[PDB]
Write a protein that binds this ligand. Sequence first.
Ligand SMILES: CCCCCCCCCCCCCCCC(=O)O
Ligand SMILES: CCCCCCCCCCCCCCCC(=O)O
Lengths: 250, 250, 250, 41, 41, 269, 269, 238, 178
Amino acid sequence: SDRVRSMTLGNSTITTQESANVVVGYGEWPSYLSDKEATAEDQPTQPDVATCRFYTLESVQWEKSSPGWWWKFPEALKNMGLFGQNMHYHYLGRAGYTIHVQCNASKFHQGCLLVVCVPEAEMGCADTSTTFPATELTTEEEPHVFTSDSITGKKVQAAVCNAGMGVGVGNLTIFPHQWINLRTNNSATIVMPYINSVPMDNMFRHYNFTLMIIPFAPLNFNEGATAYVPVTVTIAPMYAEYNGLRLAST
Amino acid sequence: SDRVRSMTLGNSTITTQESANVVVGYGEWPSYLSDKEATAEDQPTQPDVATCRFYTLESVQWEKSSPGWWWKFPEALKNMGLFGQNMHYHYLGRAGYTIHVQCNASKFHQGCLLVVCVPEAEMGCADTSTTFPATELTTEEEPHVFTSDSITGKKVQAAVCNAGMGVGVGNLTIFPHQWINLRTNNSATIVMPYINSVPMDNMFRHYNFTLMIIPFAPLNFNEGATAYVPVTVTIAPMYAEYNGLRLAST
Amino acid sequence: SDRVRSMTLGNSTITTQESANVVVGYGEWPSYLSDKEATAEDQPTQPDVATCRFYTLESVQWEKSSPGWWWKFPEALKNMGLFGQNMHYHYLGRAGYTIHVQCNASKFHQGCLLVVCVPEAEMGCADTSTTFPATELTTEEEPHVFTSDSITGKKVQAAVCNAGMGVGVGNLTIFPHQWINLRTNNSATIVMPYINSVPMDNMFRHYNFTLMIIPFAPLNFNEGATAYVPVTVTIAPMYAEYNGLRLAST
Amino acid sequence: TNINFYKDAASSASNRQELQQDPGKFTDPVKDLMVKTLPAL
Amino acid sequence: TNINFYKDAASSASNRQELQQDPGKFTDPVKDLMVKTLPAL
Amino acid sequence: RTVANTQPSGPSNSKEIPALTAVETGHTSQVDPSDTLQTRHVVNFHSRSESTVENFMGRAACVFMDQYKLNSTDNFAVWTINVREMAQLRRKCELFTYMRFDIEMTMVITSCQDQGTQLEQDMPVLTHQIMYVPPGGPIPAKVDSYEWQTSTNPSVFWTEGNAPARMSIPFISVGNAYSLFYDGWSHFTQDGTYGYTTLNAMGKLFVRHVNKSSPHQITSTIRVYFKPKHIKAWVPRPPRLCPYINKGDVNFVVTEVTDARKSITDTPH
Amino acid sequence: RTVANTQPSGPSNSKEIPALTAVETGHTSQVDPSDTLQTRHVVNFHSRSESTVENFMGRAACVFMDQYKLNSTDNFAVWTINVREMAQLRRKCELFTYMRFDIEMTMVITSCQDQGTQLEQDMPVLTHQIMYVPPGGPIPAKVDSYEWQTSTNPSVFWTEGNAPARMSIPFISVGNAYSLFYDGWSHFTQDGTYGYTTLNAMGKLFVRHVNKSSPHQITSTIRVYFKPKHIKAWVPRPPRLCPYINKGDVNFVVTEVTDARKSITDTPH
Amino acid sequence: GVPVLNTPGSTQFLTSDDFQSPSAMPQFDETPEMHIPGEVRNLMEMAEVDSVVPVNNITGKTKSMEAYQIAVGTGNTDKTKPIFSFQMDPGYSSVLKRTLLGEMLNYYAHWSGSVKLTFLFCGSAMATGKLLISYSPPGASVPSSRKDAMLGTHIIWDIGLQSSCVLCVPWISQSHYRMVQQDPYTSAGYITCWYQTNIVVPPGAPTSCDVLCFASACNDFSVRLLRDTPFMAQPGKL
Amino acid sequence: KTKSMEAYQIAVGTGNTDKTKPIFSFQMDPGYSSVLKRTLLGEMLNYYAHWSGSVKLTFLFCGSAMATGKLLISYSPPGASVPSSRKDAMLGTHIIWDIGLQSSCVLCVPWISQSHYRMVQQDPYTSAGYITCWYQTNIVVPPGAPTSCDVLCFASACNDFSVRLLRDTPFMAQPGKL
Ligand SMILES: CCCCCCCCCCCCCCCC(=O)O
Ligand SMILES: CCCCCCCCCCCCCCCC(=O)O
């Protein structure tokens, strides 16, 4: 059946029993950078399993009032195994991420998550005049929550309706998107390839994409149901190739 | 799977996820009246999609104490689109009705409906001496409810045990019958062809058949479950052919 | 002979003994909308005889002083059988109308009617500044009479010389036209196909054409001749195809 | 000459050299063929 | 017509006559083929 | 491509009666002068050229004249794009109910230099932006509004003193033809806008000066000339005898069928 | 090249359930009207032309409007070359993250002849030098500085009253596409300039009058129109509902998802 | 680049020019063409089709329907007088100027071809009479006697079952193209209808019968020089 | 609700009240309809003046897995009043959505138009139909499941869909220099 899925990228494996078809990012499977499309002359470091494995990020509780969360990849993968180590020790890096968001909910739970990988989701500042610091959008440890309404200050505009990029969140399905509907789905897998203008880019200054998990239907459970419904992102970079060995950047 | 079904008769379409195999009426699929079996020399009016579409009738709440309901077709389809208009504007009409009764209930709902198309279900009067008026059995707007016990007056004998025709209701499965068991089924489709002695009959004086929805197991739901469980009849005449254009009859 | 004619469109038939050749509208016989020229993806409802039959409209007495009459089709066919019913129950409709105007007059009657089907005869308001209501031009029940002279008010300019469209009435023969000259003709048949820019149009908002019966020579009969000379329009839509089943519009 | 210098079909010179004509749509719209050399009836 | 009068490729008319389209990148991005005539699961 | 040649004829006493026809049939007689009378063999080198709808609409005629000024809503000219504004081309287009024509607009713009107390300041060559807003598109409210940014709206950006601007427009009607005559209401309730105004809603044309301002008021007149080409006339109509009164409706004042003559037998000269 | 024709359909009672899909899959249903309902065989001669990104960007739209004067830094107009300055083409370009387009700039320049006490002196035809300084190149500080010597910088040197200047520009981005959206900091420390400002640094455009001076102040408006051609859109994005606030960042004020209607059941007309 | 010398006709907007111009919306998918019946590919087709002419355009009757009605009567009075008379040239003749051929003539400056006037007897079916419909070529006075009309081109209309005789003016001109505008050089002839025999009617039929004249263009008909129509006068902005 | 996330949420409930009332109703034309104007097809429609094709609205039931119900999603072609009864919606084009494992029924509006290209701008001539969702059956839920379930409508373009005449979008309004 299509509901069952098993992804064995690297050492870590993910097995699911209610998971719809995995959304290959824009219909193209990730692969190593070809010689035709390569602009860096350094020898590419290609750990097939050291870095191309499923990294389980911090699980965030999907509350009833939770408007959404976002992870900024690949910067959200800092301090996460040898992928983060290679990020630190390389000037240029390319990876195709097969994000797998796990939301285990019972048959009595009402809710739906748009798990969408937005390539280059330029976030808007809460105050348009200024620019937010890096901490406001970076997702090194915890997902950055979209606010239900407008916020102010030197932060990221977290209005869920505008998805933080001045863009209609309902139209976010234009990007590689999968829906975790607790009626049917408990996990969404998006195999997003390396998406950038330059064939390889630095993994700190530039975030290749943002995984936005937007609860369009808020979690609705009657009393007695599990209140701590976790939204666990398990992202596995695929065909990760790095050029430009350098001093570790911290 | 057999549980999923999709019927696209005419403009309206019906899609179901838990629906058993559709009961073709007596094993013969409806079709237009052949020249061999035709007795009317008028040119048949055959709207392929204007009249041969799914008409959603009034939804009746399946209460715990509800003994049953009946619709008298094709007279129940009066004032229902161009099928009713062609009924009014034609002396003779033939149609094969693929009735689709929708009873959406949760997994915690106990009940079972015998949705049976009884051809020529001659109804008995509550008082045997007299004859009930047309309003008592006709189903133009609302289903006529079978009573749990015997009733009296110039009405239709609505005793559910006798099915209103002096016939054992448990034996009603002799006619094209489908069971909506909320354990398994939430919708029953019976593709009943045109069933009458004469190849074409008037659609007002004669009711080609009666759709009797008899809850054999009454709806049983614990507190907290949806109490308004609707029994929605969506009947689509198929291969509807009319002869004898005349003044509209009202 | 060419004078005798017989048209058996649908259930109703028209037989005439003094009727000139039927004016096929612009030389093209009506037909169902081809797949090449179709823009609506709905399944077309095509009643071959239910709607494609001769509908006899209200007969209007051709008085000596009568300047003319007009019928606005297909809106003049409202409340006229299943053609009107399909008009009400469909968003888009196409039909080729073989109008047959019957003017039975003796051999001692002097008169001549330009029975002309003007496609899209946009009528001018009596007062140019304002726009007339729908009742002024619509021909649901009775023909709207052209006035011999100019009229004023929120009505249709009914000046017969200008044909109500600012156009020379003598030049109205540019449209599919047939003459009922009581010297020779007593009935005119114009088989006008569906004439519109869009392959199918709504039959209420837009009137596909207007049948203008303009007595160029007023009825002249000596005393003792039948004074009630009726002008009876019997219009039969042909190859009537409707898309967009919807709620009845009234 | 007749060379079209613009890709779009509408962005071309008017077809002033086309003299196709079918008056029978208006002058002879009757279903039954009418010959001038016979009575019209 | 389609003749390019400038040597540089960018110095040419827009390719407005190219109507290539692959909606499957966005409408059908799933790894396993999904046919409309079967349950999606 | 020439018209039919007059075939030679002679004396005839037969039952053919070519002259004797019946207008009751609705068929215009196909008779020739050789039929009714006796004619010589005349080879008609005359051709029905320039009488073609393609050639007849080939003559470009004005459809929109407006005055928009330099240095409110008077600084740019708004045109609900319809052929009916000018009677000269309107009656040509109203000869046919449906015309599927690729319309070739040729804007002719002439600055006026409005007579004022001071007119001693010479403004450089005035550029003119003729923007086309499709129906339902963003309609500018000022001469410097964001709508004038032609991200998608076509615009010639014509400069004065050059060849008159000309941008051929394809067939943009939602239907398969331009309904010059449309006896139909906008709404299905048969209430609303009656006439060609309903179907012939082809957007708007906003004409402005690309120059921000001038020392003295300059009111350039935009004279839009519409040349239909690739025309497909489909339902012929007579010319409107009555003068045009409204540009959004066929509403008319009654007019005589023809110029009245003293008598039915009055033949001048 | 036309769109797929609507295949003929009929009544169906099967297990195919074409209408029943799953948005949980993330795959938009490929269903047709023939699948859900019963449709006639309609040959769709409609084509997805003018909807192509090549055709959609074909419409040239303004990206830079500035006023530079004749007779300091106000005598020439400086443009940090970005599509984001004007919202009309910016939202078009922001429909896609990466667009590899050869950009066709068509400068439209109109002199204004600023209203002053004396404007009785007529200046000859004003020539305009639109110089392009590549990123990191010498940026002029005066209208007569050495940078205006175009040894390597391209320049149209357009003269007023002629056809609008147009110099097609190739794909000059250092990367393989123009990142209209770039959620990345300028520096690897993740501190600096966030947004498209980092990667979309394509130099500057300095517009000046080639004429040395004029007797009276003339402030010509440079209206740069960018026509993308040979576009390669690579990652589609939704249009930005919120109005654009900053031309160097995506920063926005919150805006409603759509125009609010009175009720979920509120259907006008 | 290529050396190009501008002709003295450069930078002009000639109205009748076959010059290609850039498309407003390039690669615009025009709505697919459908076979709408009656495709007019020439307006001489609408000239060829019959059109009731206002023969009786006497003052006041143009407003009413009697303009087209050609009055005939079963009376000995004025039998030696024309039923009607008017000028043949559809361009400027009051009768023929606003008809289909005339309206498609005043949109032009030159016209050539055989006008054919179909005359429909709109009277009693038993009303039988003989008329003499005569086109007299120009160069002589308007026919004042039936013999004078007979001396020119003429057809005897025996009113009967057909009830429509077509008087086809056989293009008797000294030039290949007559001028639509009123000029004596290309002045056309005179079309006059007389009584060859009275309109005999039975006692139960009206004497004052009516005739309709349908001026139509033959296959010979053509127009050569386009011009703005004098009929359509626009006093001001609509 | 446009500010919050409930704009997309189509509320459904296991209550007998207002069961004879539409779950929702709006205009089919993506050009000017409030619901469909800012969506992907609508946003790529207001950049144009003419639009043709079959809009397909995929409806996702974002409720309890055991919440089963039958809806009647109906496109009614124009020319008649907006459906005020479920029978009126049934008389037009409609699909019965039996909510189940698939949980997404696609209501494909079968381009019921009188012209080859409807106009994006609001005009009664090319005015589209009305898309209304009703209850064919109640949303039956177990006692442990929420009654107030949510539905998401995904308006998408079919292969037929095309736009013909480009125009500047009315949504993107620039008050001044950025
Ligand atoms: C400046 C470039 C774009 C030009 C666009 C202006 C012309 C718009 C299209 C006009 C269509 C034909 C006229 C209206 C319809 C009619 O009544 O025939
Ligand atoms: C005057 C001749 C030279 C013209 C050079 C001006 C245009 C420079 C290149 C522009 C690149 C595209 C716009 C910026 C990048 C983007 O945001 O897409």
